[PDB]
Amino acid sequence: RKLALKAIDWVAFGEIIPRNQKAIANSLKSWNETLSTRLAALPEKPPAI
Amino acid sequence: ATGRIVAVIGAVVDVQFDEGLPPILNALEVQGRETRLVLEVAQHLGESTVRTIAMDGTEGLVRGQKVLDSGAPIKIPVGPETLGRIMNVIGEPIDERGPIKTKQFAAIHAEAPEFMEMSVEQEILVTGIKVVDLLAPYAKGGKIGLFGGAGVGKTVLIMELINNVAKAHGGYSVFAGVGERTREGNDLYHEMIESGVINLKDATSKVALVYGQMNEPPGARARVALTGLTVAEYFRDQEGQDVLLFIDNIFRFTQAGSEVSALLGRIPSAVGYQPTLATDMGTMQERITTTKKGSITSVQAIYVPADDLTDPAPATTFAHLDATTVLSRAIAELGIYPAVDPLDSTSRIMDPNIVGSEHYDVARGVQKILQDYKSLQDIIAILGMDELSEEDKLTVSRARKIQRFLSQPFQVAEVFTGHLGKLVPLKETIKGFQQILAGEYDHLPEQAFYMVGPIEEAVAKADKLA
Amino acid sequence: VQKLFVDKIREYRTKRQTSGGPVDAGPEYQQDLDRELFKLKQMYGKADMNTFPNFTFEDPKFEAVEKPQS
Amino acid sequence: SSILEERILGADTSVDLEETGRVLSIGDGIARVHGLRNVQAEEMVEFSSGLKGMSLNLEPDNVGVVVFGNDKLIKEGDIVKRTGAIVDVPVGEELLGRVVDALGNAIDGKGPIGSKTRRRVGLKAPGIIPRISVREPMQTGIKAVDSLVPIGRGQRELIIGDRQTGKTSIAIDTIINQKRFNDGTDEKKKLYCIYVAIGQKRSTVAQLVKRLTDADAMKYTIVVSATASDAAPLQYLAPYSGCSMGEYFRDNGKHALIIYDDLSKQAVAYRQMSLLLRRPPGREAYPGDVFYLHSRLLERAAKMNDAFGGGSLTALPVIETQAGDVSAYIPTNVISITDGQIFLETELFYKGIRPAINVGLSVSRVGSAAQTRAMKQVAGTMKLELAQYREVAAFAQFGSDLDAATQQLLSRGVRLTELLKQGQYAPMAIEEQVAVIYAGVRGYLDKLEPSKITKFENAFLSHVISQHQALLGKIRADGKISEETDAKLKEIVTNFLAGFEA
Ligand SMILES: Nc1ncnc2c1ncn2[C@@H]1O[C@H](COP(=O)(O)OP(=O)(O)OP(=O)(O)O)[C@@H](O)[C@H]1O
Ligand SMILES: Nc1ncnc2c1ncn2[C@@H]1O[C@H](COP(=O)(O)OP(=O)(O)O)[C@@H](O)[C@H]1O
Ligand SMILES: [Mg+2]
Ligand SMILES: [Mg+2]
């Protein structure tokens, strides 16, 4: 079951504060939510033949 | 196998045999007439006596007049030579172009398909009408009803679903006329000859026709609907095609079945109908199915008596449909044509996984703004518009731009008003209602959203008036 | 009716003498078993006998983020 | 092939003297039979061609008989035989996972059902001694049902409303939602289900077996089916046959559930069948005993005491009404047999409340209040906070401004109204319900926007099943939401609210 964990990084991760680059992080967590549970149902193994 | 007439009441001839009683729903041949008179056995009244229902007129019959037994039900000639020909209840050519020569014959009465011959697969049949594409999408292989009073548009709407679906169809087609007027059944012959669907000269015709109109005796209108239903089953089970089927009007299968039920000796049920109102309907409608051998795409026009939807004859048809298009009278007093009730029309495929999750949210989100205009009509009628809030002067002005943007000019209605019939695609209605729900057109008036096609004509009509 | 019990077994054994499928098919069983064999493939799909899955997938390209900082 | 030959050697050709009555008439299903001396009432008689029928009227000259099938193979002068048995259907657990007709013959084609015991369709409801009160819950997974209008086990609850409002879907999320107990370990949390389809076309009942087989729901139900094509004495016999397979469970220990879809189509099959027997009409040409027709059905839904087995039999009758009028003849006769109701409307469905339950009118004799212990905490206060809302929240025209006074309370309702909405064929659990209801009443949502709470729910729910699985297992096991369990949830909602929208 090849799967990685992470840290709790949701609070200030949208507060990256680029040169008015709010969309850089506001799109970044938006990719982060959908990719998490969807790749979890990929990571372990295929079913029986 | 012979017998004599004993009693005659209207269209219920009594007949006594001597040996060889015919089983129920045989055919009997009355000897000594100029035309063909076929009697179909209904009952068995005891001690060698049957009670029959006649297909043509019974005037001129005397008692003792002989009656001969066929041996079989009403059979009609079915096959690929039936296309381009008009028939009646017993299957004789009434186009005066000569006989119909097929290799096989099909009885009028057959059973229903089983449980394990059903097909569940659903799709979407895009038509080109905004009210039907958005709010209540039709399927490809399911029954459709068009409920309406008298003078609302149940057949101008059915002349569109031929003009949009029977042109781009690949398989065959079957039309049936049950109890509606005869000049309309003549303008379907002189509009399918001109437009290449009927070919008088060779075998390249697509549609079949079957006709019993509102001049017949009521033993014929009660059985003409089982005739076009049989020519549209050979093209399903034995040829394997994808057939259409247009029925107008299917109420007269039932209106003319409570005119011969009084004289068979039966106590009447509620408001005057026969005791068996909803078993003969569930035996005619249970054969109009998509199955594992073909697919019939029904479109039936249904009449509601005296503009009442709780009457027992319309309100038992509802369990046999998939889509539903309840039309209305008070809508059509405003001018919204097709006068479809957006709140009363359903489907079984309006679903976010089938119709697509973007479309499903413009669907449910435009009913929400339409209900909230209805729920304030008590206060607006008495008090006024001017005693409302500012948020609820913005579900009133936005839901009067949406009602007007459901009326579309039809192709068959160019000859009435002189306006070009418009067909919209599916993807240009979802895009065109999200720009009324989000609030981009809140400066354009409401006379610009009226009787236009795609949404760019609404800003163009608004460009004209200035 | 054991005299009928023997008479439906003995004309079942005659059916067990078969050469090519149907005995009295003619144009009937040949057309129907070919009409039905299409319908189990028509709305189902075009599939051969033993061909394996042949495709290729491309993943999302990992772009970078430019950031002058401090 | 070996299968046809082995079916023909097992056939028994037994012959005996029958008892036999010549036919005198046949029309529209009724066969007045001369002869038949020693016949019983409600006996099953058998025509010559293979048809079957039930002799209702006895009379000195003739004997009225109605047919289970079709009346065109029957000619005057035929032969009617005697079976010798009041009408009975097979019963057992061996019918589980099938679709059957109204006399117990399979219409799915998986074969002959191997059944061993036969039980009448006209048996009697149990009296006053062998019952007990309603102790247990029945979870539907709907959130407007489980919190506000709970349903015990053994309680007749009426789903009433119009056409195309949600009456079938409400009773099919209930079939799906018991999947989690039926693969569990204890034999007293299961719920075996039964669906009775009366007056429905076969392109709805063959489509509902599809929706009940991807989710593997069909491995624990039975479908008794009498379609609109059937004989009118087969739509009359169907709920009395489906209810008699329910009482294999209840009279042996387990817990059953039964849906009649619907019971306004078991009445017009009694009006027609008993007008052609020349019985005089009552109101709307209904017979005299339509109240006795439904009442002798809805009283078998018992809850037995624990010295008999303790089993239960819930019932969920569906009723279609015309134009939303509840004062009709057949509605009011069945409102006053059931303990509680669920009033489904149309203006709720279209404004957006789906499942469209009128939570104001959906009264329920609460069933000894077997809601559950943790839901009592959060939906006890919810019931009052929603009731406080409905008295005061119907203006649509504002002139004055009282944000400290009124606008705080009506902001608690729209956060709890839009919480109550649900999807379709995805029913929740009870501890996944306690979590999402906790966050609504404890003020932890008044800083959102109401157009984002349906989006807030699924992101919340996916976070707790993934990261907090040992949290929810202490609510389901311990029953209550304890004070230290109140402590742990206080951070999780606020930690997620700190990083929800970013
Ligand atoms: N929870 C839900 N949320 C939104 N829509 C729903 C929900 N449940 C059902 N629907 C939709 O409502 C429509 C009617 O539901 P349903 O078929 O159960 O009504 P019904 O009254 O049983 O129909 P009938 O009158 O034919 O018996 C369906 O199109 C269904 O997709
Ligand atoms: N789309 C439409 N646009 C304009 N007028 C219409 C439309 N549909 C119907 N009408 C009017 O309503 C009438 C409807 O009658 P018709 O559809 O022929 O039969 P029915 O009485 O069964 O509806 C038509 O004569 C026409 O005047
Ligand atoms: Mg018309
Ligand atoms: Mg229903």
Backbone angles phi, psi at D333, to 5 degrees: -70, -15
Interface check for A48 against chain D (CB to CB < 8 A): the answer is no
Cα separation of B269 and B266, whole Å? 9
Question: Measuring from atom 13 of ligand 1, which residue has the nearest CA?
Answer: D164
Give residues 8 to 37 of C whose Cβ lies within 8 Å of D: 8-9, 12
Ordered by where they begin, the domains of chain D are 16-85 (2.40.30.20), 86-371 (3.40.50.300), 372-501 (1.20.150.20)
Q: Which residues pair with B152 in a beta bridge?
A: none
Evaluate whether D303 touches D309 at the Cβ level (below 8 Å). no
Cα–chain-centroid distance for residue D63?
A: 37
Asked whether residue B179 falls in the same domain as residue B82, the answer is yes
Asked whether residue B170 falls in the same domain as residue B247, the answer is yes
Instruction: Count other C-beta atoms under 10 Å from residue D305's C-beta.
Output: 14
Cα separation of B232 and B241, whole Å? 10
Single out the residue of B180, B256, B267 nearest to residue D277, CA to CA: B267
B neighbour chains, 3+ CB pairs within 8 Å: C, D
Q: Is B59 exposed, middle or buried (0-12, 13-18, 19+ CB in 10 A)?
A: exposed
Written as one letter, the residue type at D360 is G
List the catalytic residue out of D118, D365, D373, D390: D365
Give residues 41 to 70 of C whose Cβ lies within 8 Å of A: 65, 67-68
CA dihedral sign of residues D177, D180, D186, D187? positive
Backbone angles phi, psi at B211, to 5 degrees: -140, 125
Single out the residue of D68, D202, D147 nearest to residue B117, CA to CA: D202
Evaluate whether C7 touches D13 at the Cβ level (below 8 Å). no
Q: Which of B132, B155, B156, B408 has most ligand 2 atoms within 8 Å of its beta carbon, as the pocket-test mutant? A: B156
CATH number for the domain including B65?
2.40.10.170
Asked whether residue B282 falls in the same domain as residue B356, the answer is no
Interface check for D3 against chain C (CB to CB < 8 A): the answer is no
Q: Is D97 exposed, middle or buried (0-12, 13-18, 19+ CB in 10 A)?
A: middle
Q: Is D275 exposed, middle or buried (0-12, 13-18, 19+ CB in 10 A)?
A: buried
Q: What is the CA radius of gyration of chain D?
A: 27
Cα separation of D307 and C42, whole Å? 60
| Residues with Cβ within 8 Å of residue D51, at least 6 apart in sequence | D67, D68, D69, D70, D73, D74
The full DSSP string for B374-402 is HTTHHHHHHT-GGGS-SSTTSSSSSSHHH
**Encoding tokens for residue C2?**
């054991």
Single out the residue of D473, D108, D134 nearest to residue D305, CA to CA: D134
Cα separation of B189 and A30, whole Å? 61
Q: What is the CA radius of gyration of chain B?
A: 26
Backbone angles phi, psi at D175, to 5 degrees: -70, -40
Asked whether residue B309 falls in the same domain as residue B446, the answer is no
Q: What is the CA radius of gyration of chain A?
A: 15
Q: Which residues pair with B175 in a beta bridge?
A: B209, B246
C neighbour chains, 3+ CB pairs within 8 Å: A, B, D
Asked whether residue B239 falls in the same domain as residue B355, the answer is no
Asked whether residue B445 falls in the same domain as residue B339, the answer is no
Cα separation of D43 and D55, whole Å? 6
Asked whether residue B345 falls in the same domain as residue B372, the answer is no
Backbone angles phi, psi at D249, to 5 degrees: -65, -55
Single out the residue of D290, D198, D189 nearest to residue D242, CA to CA: D198
**Encoding tokens for residue D424?**
């379709």
Q: Is D133 exposed, middle or buried (0-12, 13-18, 19+ CB in 10 A)?
A: exposed
Evaluate whether B173 touches B244 at the Cβ level (below 8 Å). yes
| Residues with Cβ within 8 Å of residue D176, at least 6 apart in sequence | D141, D212, D215, D217, D425, D427
Q: Which domain holds residue B68?
A: 1-73
DSSP D8: H
Cα separation of B326 and B149, whole Å? 10
- Report the 3 state secondary structure along B159-195: CHHHHCCCCCCCCCEEEEEECCCCCCCCCCCCCCCCC
Q: How was this structure determined?
A: cryo-EM
CA dihedral sign of residues B198, B200, B202, B208? positive
The half-sphere exposure of D346 on its side-chain side, counting CA atoms within 13 A, is 19
Asked whether residue B344 falls in the same domain as residue B355, the answer is no
Distance set, CA B177 to CA B15, B181, B188, B195, B325 (Å): 31, 9, 11, 20, 20
Asked whether residue B49 falls in the same domain as residue B66, the answer is yes
Evaluate whether B29 touches B37 at the Cβ level (below 8 Å). yes
Interface check for A27 against chain D (CB to CB < 8 A): the answer is no
The half-sphere exposure of B29 on its side-chain side, counting CA atoms within 13 A, is 14
| Residues with Cβ within 8 Å of residue D54, at least 6 apart in sequence | D42, D43, D44, D45, D65, D66, D68, D87, D233
Evaluate whether D253 touches D315 at the Cβ level (below 8 Å). no
Cα–chain-centroid distance for residue D312?
A: 14
Cα separation of D223 and D204, whole Å? 13
Bridging pattern class, strands D316-320 and D157-161: parallel
Cα separation of D221 and D194, whole Å? 5
Asked whether residue B232 falls in the same domain as residue B329, the answer is yes
- Domain end, chosen from B349, B375, B404, is at B349
Q: What is the CA radius of gyration of chain C?
A: 31
Evaluate whether B275 touches B225 at the Cβ level (below 8 Å). no
Interface check for C35 against chain B (CB to CB < 8 A): the answer is yes
Evaluate whether B8 touches B256 at the Cβ level (below 8 Å). no
D355: preceding bond cis by omega (within 30 degrees): yes
Cα–chain-centroid distance for residue D450?
A: 34
CATH number for the domain including B162?
3.40.50.300
**Encoding tokens for residue B16?**
């006594």
Ion ligand 3: residues, CB within 5 A, are: B 155
Say if ligand 1 is within 6 A of residue D422 CB.
yes
Evaluate whether B114 touches B120 at the Cβ level (below 8 Å). no
Question: Measuring from atom 8 of ligand 2, which residue has the nearest CA?
Answer: B153
**Residues in chain C closer than 8 A to D5 (CB atoms):** 9, 12
CA dihedral sign of residues D168, D172, D175, D178? negative
Nearest by CB to residue B45, choosing from D25, D281, D322, is D25
| Active site annotation includes D365 | yes
Rounded to the nearest 5 degrees, what angle is found at the Cα of B68, between the Cα atoms of B62 and B70? 140
**Residues in chain C closer than 8 A to B121 (CB atoms):** 43
Measure D177 CA to ligand 1 centroid, in angstroms.
17
Distance set, CA B368 to CA B343, D55, D275 (Å): 10, 54, 45
According to DSSP H, which parts of D215-323 are helical? 232-236, 238-249, 268-273, 290-295
Cα separation of B28 and C43, whole Å? 45
Rounded to the nearest 5 degrees, what angle is found at the Cα of B240, between the Cα atoms of B235 and B243? 50
* Number of domains within chain B: 3
Evaluate whether B136 touches B322 at the Cβ level (below 8 Å). no
User: Quick one: residue B67, left, alpha or beta (phi over 0 = left, psi -120 to 50 = alpha)?
Assistant: beta
Bridging pattern class, strands D79-86 and D21-22: antiparallel
Torsion angle of the four alpha carbons B119, B120, B125, B131, in this order, in degrees rounded to the nearest 10: 140
- Domain end, chosen from B29, B44, B73, is at B73
Only one residue has tokens 């009264």, namely D363
Q: After which residues does chain B show a gap where C to N exceeds 2.5 Å?
A: none
Evaluate whether D496 touches D463 at the Cβ level (below 8 Å). yes
Identify the closest residue of chain D to A6 by CA–CA distance. Answer: D467
Q: Is D79 helix (H, G, I), strand (E, B) or coil?
A: strand
CA dihedral sign of residues B180, B186, B189, B192? negative
Only one residue has tokens 């919204």, namely B336
Q: Is D347 exposed, middle or buried (0-12, 13-18, 19+ CB in 10 A)?
A: middle
Single out the residue of B349, B448, B317 nearest to residue B133, CA to CA: B349
Cβ of B44 within 8 Å of Cβ of D203? The answer is no
According to DSSP H, which parts of B33-100 are helical? none
Cα–chain-centroid distance for residue D394?
A: 34
Single out the residue of D420, D424, D442, D432 nearest to residue D491, CA to CA: D442
Distance set, CA B102 to CA A7, B84, B106, B226 (Å): 79, 14, 11, 19
Asked whether residue B105 falls in the same domain as residue B16, the answer is no
Cα separation of D478 and D485, whole Å? 10
- Domain end, chosen from B330, B349, B368, is at B349
Asked whether residue B53 falls in the same domain as residue B86, the answer is no
Instruction: Count other C-beta atoms under 10 Å from residue D274's C-beta.
Output: 25
